[PDB]
Design a protein around this ligand. Structure first.
Ligand code: OGK
Lengths: 13, 145, 566, 145, 145, 69
């Protein structure tokens, strides 16, 4: 769980 | 011989040392995209043609000045919208020579004119509040320069 | 005048040897060359700050112009490493103050950087600091940023990508706007700034004639219109926010992008805004669709328009369909990274899976590929085989297979890995992360047998038993750094493989047959070899590395240093 | 036409633009010592000859690259002691084409070799105590670069 | 007949036994560089001239003293800067008659003068701290010599 | 030699040689001095750890083995 996409996968939803 | 692809699908056959006047096209024979021709989609094809014409002639300073300031001056007998598009293009590519002529041409329009005469002959709306204009005018005449 | 020797000329020539590995050799030919290299070395990278004391660094290379230190283990980028683990930058900045008086550029990667340590850096180095990169660092605030932008008035490149800090105000950006002229690259790509003003950024563009690259947080792209007109020489832009509202159907459509922009990624870009790229897509050499809101269909349509694309980063939504498109339109492709997408409620769409189909397509189309990293939903030995046959001069290859799918076509991947490693003989970095059935002890030995040039490896769920680790361990002539997680191997097998590996200097392992005993790891106790445990508070981690310095002074409570009999 | 007096009384008739490749001989037509020919007593006559040969050929890039890297490579098929004397000479004069080229040529000999191969092909005695060699080797592989 | 090439490209036609007064030019007809004339680029041409004049006259002690101390004394009626350049030159060549004689000539200028008179007639700045001057003066007058 | 934890001195006479020489090399460690007394009796191998580096004072009958000739 990369820390840059974990921020995005949530700013997405 | 190098291929330059304009911003409306228009291939241009141009010589080696001509295309090299642009440091943008030169720094692009390192990672050579030249395989598919150099893709420069920000220059109109009408403009890119004029750019190449300018580079063509200046490279022919191989046979070695007086007649150049002549061709140059005559090359600049164009309209504003086109002068501007040349500047933008010389900056997009990287033709230091080419910009010194167009930019200077625009600057010669400004030189000597008053602020009213300037926005007149470029159609610019004076958007200064009168306080602003006054401060600037005072700074200019009482303090600086 | 006597016969001129190399000695009469080596001071001069040394400064034309640029390759770090050739400097390495040169420094070893004799006491004099050692000294010349010592006094002329311009750049040094330290892959692990704890490997030597700052005193040692500055005694060996007193005239460094450029330094780059890494701290926390790579695993930290995946929330596996405690925040307080280490990587404090502060002894290094005090050493820089006193003894590296020539330093013009500093890159800290994955380190703890405080406001005090950046205030000290700023005052010590001031106008001489041309470049500062806070790269995935933490521990500072906007006070620190302000301090370096006010004392370092000539910063050319300033970077904070993915760093976490406390944002108290926006005056750092404003301070640049008001006085900085020299900025060439400004990068806060993956960062929460809510107090900075887009006006300031615009004014920086207007003042910095050499501004070539800027990456940014969640600025409304519309607010950057002024910025884009002013950034005449911009070649790269990433970030911003594209926020559509149904209200304005053509909200964008009127973006002036700098005529030179050729490396870009607009965040949240949807299919409706995608088209603002078409006018100059022929020009685009780098694409970052990593934070894009577009679907597998939309990828194909954009990829299709970028014949000169050499770098593409994206989520797995790209799909097999997208890889097929990329396969014949972008023949010049050099680097491809397919991160993993929203993997909870269906793969973002019913094409957002990449598989054997895509991989094999890609292998055949983009034969120039040097870097390929892929989270794949399903593989086959055949696809690995084609990678190995078609795309030589691959330097870095990473494959992770997702855990989503239940059935994987054919699983034991031994024969595929083997031809992959045999064809791609330029390979320096290699990651292979699977599921238990994925690779057999026989395959694991293949990896060790056919990877003569590999310096770094991340191994996923490979092997079946210690037999595989041990067989692996008799290979890897050049393995320097080894990262393994989710493997079965026992403490004594790890220890024994470390002993066998000629080049190993760094080992990180998560998941292994432990033993409260502890005492089995001990069978790899060598001098200069530091072993650290992060206890099972996630499964126990083992970190071990060579160091000239001895055991770190600054361990947290969560980290236990392993020493001889307790 | 300029006269260059070598370090063993040996006059050299050389063209204008050839002798000007050396910024040392150029900065010496200001306070023109040329009255008695340029006195450069630090270059062997054998060496000076080779220097002039190089400059002669490079100036003939008037007729305007591929064949140059050829002549250059063939020009460098000399022995070490002579290569080094050329470097010292390019530095003494000021021929950047010849210093960025000779220095690069010696550097190309080091590149890729191991420390043993290096002192082999230069005949240099390894004077490291074994402790020193070890520390340096450890620094190099565990810590720096 | 031998050729001497001065330090500014200036050939000098000089007789056999004249050039041989210099053991530096004599030890240089063994490995005879004379092929291109003896290259001596450390003697000014003005100075070398004066050296040859001296050697010319002394060799003419073939016809065999009284009139020599006369010509010699008159030869030395020069200025300091030139006297010193002669010394340096006699040492550079190897003309002992010109060394036991030039050195003696400068020493004759010091002999009898006081420390002040010495730095007067040589223009030398007294850089002693007063403590140093005093210690030396005390040593000199109370203790040694 | 590589496997033996404590070995600091080795003397060997009689062994399957090879003019190559280069097989003994696979025990080249730092501080490990290997000396050959050539087959002028069968070749001898003398090897020992030393903090001092290679002896200065070898006869002609004794060849010090170093990396690639
Ligand atoms: C300690 C291991 C971490 C464990 C993490 C895990 O769960 C799987 C991978 C991830 C890791 C990884 O680095 N993934 C890649 C990547 O470069 O990000 C290599 C993959 C790219 C294609 C690291």
């Amino acid at each position: 769980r990369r820390a840059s996409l974990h921020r995005f996968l949530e700013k997405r939803k | 011989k190098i291929v330059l692809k304009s911003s409306d699908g228009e291939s241009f056959e141009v010589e080696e040392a001509v295309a090299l006047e642009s440091q943008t096209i030169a720094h692009m024979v390192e990672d050579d995209c030249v395989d598919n021709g150099v893709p420069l989609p920000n220059v109109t094809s009408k403009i890119l043609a004029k750019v190449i014409e300018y580079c063509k002639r200046h490279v022919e300073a191989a046979a070695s000045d007086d007649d150049l300031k002549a061709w140059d001056a005559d090359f600049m007998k164009i309209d504003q919208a086109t002068l501007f598009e040349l500047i933008l293009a010389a900056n997009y590519l990287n033709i230091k020579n080419l910009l010194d002529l167009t930019c200077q041409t625009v600057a010669d329009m400004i030189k000597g004119k008053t602020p009213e005469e300037i926005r007149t002959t470029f159609n610019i709306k004076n958007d200064f509040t009168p306080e602003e204009e006054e401060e600037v005018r005072r700074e200019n005449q009482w303090a600086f320069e | 005048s006597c016969v001129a020797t190399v000695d009469d000329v080596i001071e001069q020539v040394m400064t034309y040897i640029t390759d770090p590995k050739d400097r390495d050799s040169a420094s070893l030919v004799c006491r004099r060359w050692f000294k010349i290299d010592s006094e002329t070395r311009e750049h040094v990278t330290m892959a692990l700050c704890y490997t030597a004391t700052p005193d040692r660094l500055s005694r060996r290379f007193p005239n460094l112009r450029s330094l780059k230190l890494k701290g926390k283990p790579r695993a930290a980028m995946f929330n596996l490493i405690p925040e307080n683990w280490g990587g404090y930058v502060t002894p290094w900045v005090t050493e820089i103050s006193n003894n590296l008086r020539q330093l013009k550029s500093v890159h800290f990667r994955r380190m703890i950087v405080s406001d005090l340590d950046l205030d000290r850096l700023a005052k010590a180095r001031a106008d001489d600091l041309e470049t500062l990169k806070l790269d995935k660092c933490s521990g500072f605030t906007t006070d620190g940023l302000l301090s370096i932008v006010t004392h370092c008035r000539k910063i050319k490149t300033l970077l904070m990508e993915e760093s976490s800090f406390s944002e108290k105000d926006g005056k750092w950006l404003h301070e640049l706007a008001q006085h900085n002229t020299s900025l060439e690259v400004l990068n806060f790509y993956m960062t929460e700034f809510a107090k900075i003003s887009p006006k300031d950024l615009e004014t920086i563009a207007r003042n910095c004639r050499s501004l070539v690259s800027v990456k940014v947080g969640d600025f409304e792209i519309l607010e950057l219109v002024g910025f884009f007109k002013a950034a005449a020489n911009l070649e790269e832009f990433c970030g911003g926010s594209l926020n559509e509202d149904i209200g304005m159907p053509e909200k964008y459509m009127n973006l002036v992008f700098p005529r030179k922009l050729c490396r870009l990624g607009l965040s949240y870009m949807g299919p409706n805004e995608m088209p603002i790229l078409f006018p100059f897509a022929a020009q685009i050499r780098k694409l970052d669709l990593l934070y894009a809101l577009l679907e597998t269909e939309d990828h194909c349509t954009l990829i299709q328009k970028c014949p000169n694309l050499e770098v593409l980063e994206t989520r797995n939504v790209i799909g097999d369909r997208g890889l097929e498109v990329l396969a014949q339109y972008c023949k010049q492709l050099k680097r491809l990274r397919i991160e993993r997408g929203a993997d909870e409620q269906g793969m973002e769409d019913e094409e957002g899976l990449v598989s054997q189909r895509g991989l094999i397509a890609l292998a055949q189309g983009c034969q120039e590929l040097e870097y390929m990293a892929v989270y794949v939903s399903d593989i086959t030995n055949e696809s690995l085989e084609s990678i190995g046959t078609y795309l030589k001069n691959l330097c870095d290859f990473r494959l992770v297979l997702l855990d989503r799918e239940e059935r994987i076509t054919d699983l034991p991947l031994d024969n595929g890995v083997r031809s992959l490693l045999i064809g791609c003989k330029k390979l320096r970095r290699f990651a292979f992360y699977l599921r238990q059935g994925g690779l057999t002890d026989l395959g694991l030995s293949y990896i060790g047998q056919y990877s003569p040039n590999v310096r770094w490896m991340l191994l996923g769920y490979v092997g079946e038993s210690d037999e595989g680790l041990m067989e692996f361990s008799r290979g890897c002539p050049n393995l320097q750094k080894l990262e393994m997680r989710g493997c079965c191997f026992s403490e004594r097998a790890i220890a024994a493989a470390v002993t066998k590996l000629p080049s190993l200097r760094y080992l990180w392992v998560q998941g292994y047959r432990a033993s409260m005993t502890g005492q089995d790891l001990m069978q790899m106790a060598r001098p200069y070899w530091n072993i650290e445990l992060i206890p099972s508070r996630h499964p126990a981690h083992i970190l071990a590395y060579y160091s000239l310095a001895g055991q770190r002074t600054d361990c947290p409570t969560t980290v236990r240093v392993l020493k001889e009999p307790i």
